[PDB]
Amino acid sequence: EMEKEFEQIDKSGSWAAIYQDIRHEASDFPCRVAKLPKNKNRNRYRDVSPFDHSRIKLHQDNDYINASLIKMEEAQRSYILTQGPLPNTCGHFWEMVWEQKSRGVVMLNRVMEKGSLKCAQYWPQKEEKEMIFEDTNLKLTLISEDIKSYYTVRQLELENLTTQETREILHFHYGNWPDQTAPESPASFLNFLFKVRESGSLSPEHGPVVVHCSAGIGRSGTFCLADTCLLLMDKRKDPSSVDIKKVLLEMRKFRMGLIQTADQLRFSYLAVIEGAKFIMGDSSVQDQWKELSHED
Ligand SMILES: [Mg+2]
Ligand SMILES: [Mg+2]
């Protein structure tokens, strides 16, 4: 059992060992396109690249973006994990959103973190100042935003200027989750995860949700791992049936480095264990998460 195992690892103080074993067993696949000279300025970090086999290809001369399709066959959910767009890849980012028919973007970082710019300002901050990405012929307008205590939800309108088709994109922006560390509480993380779920952005009738932090592997991996684990129990109505480490290693077949610290691994256990309360039919813990969240 996941809860049994968690208590064993915690009392033996074994999280670093457990996490290091995951790194040693992780898949290794070529990243030849990411490493082409013409793509150097499309990568935020030299050591975080998409595998060729799972990378998202842009439809419109150079198809390269630092983004990976994580396709969880058994859970029947997909995610696109990507780096925080650079100043020259914001048009590529929204082209990917458009071509993949994604309905939601989950942003787990702030634009400035730790004294440095971790992400370009790739969405409009003011309704009256829309953004046009001339390289990809897309227009992006801020329609509304709901600013909560530690996260913000925005409605964006993304228009294809060629066809004049428009789509609503929901932006879920986590405000106080730093890299390397674990979120303040499972409650606030789960409250946020369930807001994304409730929006319909994860439905299979849409493209995969787009998830990013700065590198698109640490906080982003934690988000997807918890969501996939909860979905697997939901499908089986069986929390015992879920092996978190097996699921993480499966995710790492599609993008390198998912979950960057032993603390993030331990938090994933905490989050899935607490989230299981809701999956198995205690719908009122979701209310307690919102209370514990102090989102107002
Ligand atoms: Mg429009
Ligand atoms: Mg169209």
From Swiss-Prot:
Bilayer disposition of the protein: Peripheral membrane protein
GO terms of molecular function: cadherin binding; enzyme binding; ephrin receptor binding; insulin receptor binding; non-membrane spanning protein tyrosine phosphatase activity; protein kinase binding; protein phosphatase 2A binding; protein tyrosine phosphatase activity
Residues carrying S-nitrosocysteine: 213
Residue intervals passing through the bilayer: none
Tissue expression per record: Expressed in keratinocytes (at protein level).
Keywords: Acetylation, Endoplasmic reticulum, Hydrolase, Membrane, Oxidation, Phosphoprotein, Protein phosphatase, S-nitrosylation
Any one biological process term the GO annotation gives: negative regulation of phosphatidylinositol 3-kinase/protein kinase B signal transduction
All residue ranges annotated as the Tyrosine-protein phosphatase domain in the record: 2-275
List of residues that carry Cysteine sulfenic acid (-SOH): 213
Residue numbers of Phosphoserine PTMs: 49, 240-241
Residue numbers carrying Cysteine sulfinic acid (-SO2H): 213
Linked residues for N,N-(cysteine-1,S-diyl)serine (Cys-Ser): 213-214
Catalytic activity reported: O-phospho-L-tyrosyl-[protein] + H2O = L-tyrosyl-[protein] + phosphate
Enzyme class, spelled out: hydrolase
Modified-residue entries (Cysteine persulfide), positions: 213
Compartments where found: Endoplasmic reticulum membrane
PTM comment text: Oxidized on Cys-213; the Cys-SOH formed in response to redox signaling reacts with the alpha-amido of the following residue to form a sulfenamide cross-link, triggering a conformational change that inhibits substrate binding and activity. The active site can be restored by reduction. Ser-49 is the major site of phosphorylation as compared to Ser-240 and Ser-241. Activated by phosphorylation at Ser-49.
Cellular component annotations (GO), alphabetically ordered: cytoplasm; cytoplasmic side of endoplasmic reticulum membrane; cytosol; early endosome; endoplasmic reticulum; endosome lumen; glutamatergic synapse; mitochondrial crista
EC numbers on record: 3.1.3.48
Keyword Acetylation: yes
Residues bearing the modification Phosphotyrosine: 19, 64
Similarity remark: Belongs to the protein-tyrosine phosphatase family. Non-receptor class 1 subfamily.
The protein's name: Tyrosine-protein phosphatase non-receptor type 1
Annotated source species: Homo sapiens (Human)
